[PDB]
Amino acid sequence: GSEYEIRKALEELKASTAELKRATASLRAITEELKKNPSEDALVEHNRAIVEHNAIIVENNRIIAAVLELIVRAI
């Protein structure tokens, strides 16, 4: 069903958005610690954390694109 499939994808998007919100909270906390106590080791960890955060954004966009296709098929 078009309606059921769209809601399923929107629920996946909701879960991805919440995962992103949690990751943003962690990233902002280590950013404040980086500003207080900078070092090469801290920067490397911070860069790695940014990349993980970007990967969550990419998944969020992938789901958005899937919802758009389902909508276009429904209309």
Q: Which residues bind a copy of itself (CB under 8 A)?
A: 6-7, 10, 13-14, 17, 20-21, 24, 27-28, 31, 34-35, 38, 40-41, 43-44, 46-48, 50-51, 53-55, 57-58, 60-62, 64-65, 67-69, 71-72, 74-75
Smallest distance, a copy of itself to C-beta of residue 66, A: 10
Residue 23: name the closest of 49, 58, 61, 62 by CA: 49
Min dist CB 22 to a copy of itself, Å, is: 11
End-to-end Cα separation, the chain, in angstroms: 13
In terms of DSSP H, where are the helices of 1-75? 2-36, 40-74
Q: Which CB, 1 or 75, lies closer to a copy of itself?
A: 75
Q: How far apart are CA 36 and CA 13, in angstroms?
A: 35
